[PDB]
Each structure stands twice: as C-alpha cells, then as structure tokens.
Amino acid sequence: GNRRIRSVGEMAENQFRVGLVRVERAVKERLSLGDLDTLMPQDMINAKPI
Amino acid sequence: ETLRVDPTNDRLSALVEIYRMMRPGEPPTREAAESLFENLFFSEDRYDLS
Amino acid sequence: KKRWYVVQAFSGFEGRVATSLREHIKLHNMEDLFGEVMVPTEEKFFPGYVLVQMVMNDASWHLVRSVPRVMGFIGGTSDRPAPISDKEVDAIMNRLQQTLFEPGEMVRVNDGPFADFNGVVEEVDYEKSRLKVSVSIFGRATPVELDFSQVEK
DNA sequence: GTCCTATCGATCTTCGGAAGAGATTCAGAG
DNA sequence: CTCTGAATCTCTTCCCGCGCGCCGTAGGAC
C-alpha cells in the first residue's frame, strides 16, 4: 500500500520532460536575446536534446 | 525544546540560516533567500506532488 | 568610481559571456552600475577571464552570476569579490593599446597534404619569406618547397 | 563538413546502506 | 580556561568463477 508501479508510459514521459526542460532552458535565453522578428519556431528549438 | 535550541530570531534570520546551511560559499540576500526558499517547496519548477 | 572585477567564463564562450553581460545590464537597466567589459585579444591575453568595470552591490553581485556561462568573480572571499589594482588596470590597458629556420633543423609542416610530416631543412628560401624542406616521398625523397607558414618549431 | 576546443566559468549531480573506526569537536568540570 | 569526558564528523568495507549481450567525446567556428 506504499509502493507503486511505474511503467514505460511514465518513465518515457519523465525522460521526455527532462529533454523538454533542457530545451526550454536553452530557448528561453534564445528568445530573451533574439530579435523575435526574423525568428521562426523551428529556429527556437533543436531536436538534439530531446 | 526546539525553541531552546533555535539560534535564529525571525524571518530574516530564518532565511539567512537556511541560505547559509543550504549553500556554503554563497552570501545570503533578502531578494535571493526567497528565490531559494520558494524554489525549495513552493515553486512548480522544483516541487510537484503527482 | 567603477573598479574592475575579474570573472570566470567558459573558455571558448568568452565573447558570448561579454555579450550576455552587455544585454543583461541594459535589460535590468543597471547601466549606471557597469562601465565597460574587457576581453583583450591579440592577432588572447587572458584565456578565460573577463574583466568587467563595475561597482559592488548585492544586486550587481547576483546580476553578473545571472549572466550565462559565468560562475562568478575571482577574489579573496565569495561575499566580497575584490578588484584587481590601480596599476593592474593601467598595465592591461597599456598592453591592449601597444624564429629563423636554421639549416639542418628537423621540422614538421603546418598545413597542406604534407601537413605534420617529419621533414628536415635542406636549403634557405629566406628573402622570399618561403622555405624548402626535404621529405621522404616515393624513395626519391624529393626537394620540396613550402611556405613560411608551414614551419613547426 | 570539418575539427575544433573544453569540460554547470548562471546545475544541482539523489535521497532504498550498515558499521565500524578514528578523528574532530564540544561540555560540563573542576 | 582548558581538561578530560562524550558526540558528532568523515572514511572503508562488503565470496569465487563463469558465460552471454549492448554500449562506448561534444559543441562550436572556418
């Protein structure tokens, strides 16, 4: 009654969240310093961390 | 009995002691001790009960 | 009076450190707290240290560490980072304002298809600002001429 | 694309070890 | 005022072989 079972759909979700946290960390700074005019959402993010 | 062992006085004292014991080598500051305490257990980025 | 302070910075990201400080000064409108930020460079004096003209306020102490790729300043204690000196700034600004291939020497090349090969000086192309170094090609180790930029001493 | 330099020089590295031994501090203790 | 108590700190340690099997520098500048 105190131990619960994590499965693939939760561990994978957590790993995806970690990747998205890294991506947010990068792109918050990019948007703070970016000119926001020529930028497009593809420029904001890169798939590599996720 | 905890009161008798407490060396701190008030909220400023609490934040100073928490900052010092949490981060050795880091100076306390009123505007920053909040940034540490709230992130500890009240900020979504670093606390989330499922 | 804004004394200079030295800050640790990611080597290779040092220019981005200076720029990220420059943006953050204006964004936090602390323009009245920062005079200049120096990254001296020659054709880099300080490999991985950023000099910032600054005053000492706790807001500025946290502002600099709020710039990316910045651990913090170098000083006696973390509570109070220290400036450099009176004459140290002047010396750094002074510098910021202000070899012969001996025959027979064994060299290595710097660029080209023959880059980094065991050659040996064979003659002197001196007044050409050039070079000629013997190397071991197809048994007919050929008399091979190089640019002066192709030395490795 | 190649080749480079550098290595949380703005995080948080895990919380489900136990013990056993020293070594290092403290605390009434005269 | 330190001394000679505990108490609270960090460090060291944890059976033998044997097989599979994967998995194994990174981001940035010319």
Cα-Cα-Cα-Cα dihedral sign, residues C9, C69, C74, C6: positive
What is the distance, to the nearest Å, from the Cα of residue C80 to the centroid of all Cα atoms in its chain? 28
Mention every residue, 6+ apart, whose C-beta is less than 8 A from residue A22.
A49, A50
Q: For residues B13 and C51, give the distance between their C-alpha atoms in angstroms, rounded to a whole number.
A: 35
Q: In 3D, which of C89, C16, C77, C83 has the Cα closest to residue C48?
A: C16
The residues with which C8 forms a beta bridge, in sequence order, are C49
Let me know: does C121 contact C105? Beta carbons within 8 Å: yes
Technique used to solve these coordinates: cryo-EM
Least Cα separation, residue C1 to chain B (angstroms): 24
In this structure, chain B runs to a length of 50
Residue C45 CA to residue C6 CA, distance in Å, equals 13
Cα separation, B39 vs A47, whole angstroms? 28
Tally of CB atoms within 10 A around C79: 12
Check CB contact under 8 Å for C23 and A33: yes
Instruction: Give yes or no for a contact between A49 and A23, defined as CB atoms under 8 angstroms apart.
Output: yes
Distance of CA A26 to CAs A15, A18, C6, C22, C64, Å? 17, 13, 26, 18, 18
Which tokens in the block code for residue A16? 């995806």
Which residues have CB under 8 Å from C127's CB, separation 6+?
Answer: none
Query: What is the extent of the structural domain holding C28?
Result: 1-98
Collect all residues of chain B within an 8 Å Cβ-Cβ radius of residue C79.
27
What are the tokens at B21? 């014991």
Of B27, B5, A29, the residue nearest C17 (C-alpha): A29
| b (16+ CB within 10 A) / e for A10-47 | eeeeeeeeeeeeebeeebeeeeeeeeeeeeeeeeeeee
Mutation choice for C interface testing from A32, A35, A36 by most C CBs within 10 A? A32
Two structure tokens written together for C98: 């202000």
* Sign of the CA dihedral with C28 first, then C29, C33, and C37 last: positive
CA distances from A21 to A28, A49, C96 (A): 10, 9, 42
Integer distance in angstroms from the first to the last C-alpha of chain B?
Answer: 35
Q: Which residue of C has its CA nearest to B35?
A: C62
Tell me if C135 sits within 8 A of C141, measured CB to CB. Answer: yes
Structure token digits, residue C5? 């302070």
**Measuring CA to CA, how many Å separate B45 from each of A18, A28, B35, B40?**
12, 14, 12, 9
- Cβ neighbours of C41 (radius 10 Å): 11
What are the CA-CA distances from residue B6 to residues B12, B15, C14, C60, C118 (Å)?
14, 13, 45, 33, 73
Q: Residue C19: exposed, middle, or buried by beta-carbon count in 10 A (0-12, 13-18, 19+)?
A: middle
CB neighbourhood size of C114 (10 A): 16
Q: Which residue has the tokens 């062992």?
A: B5
Resolution in A: 3.1
The domain that holds C67 is classified in CATH as 3.30.70.940
Interface contact flag, C68 A32, Cβ < 8 Å: no
Listed in sequence order, the DSSP H helices in A1-50 are 8-33, 41-44
The answer to whether the beta carbons of residues C133 and C144 sit under 8 Å apart is: yes
- Helix H or strand E encompassing B16: helix B11-22
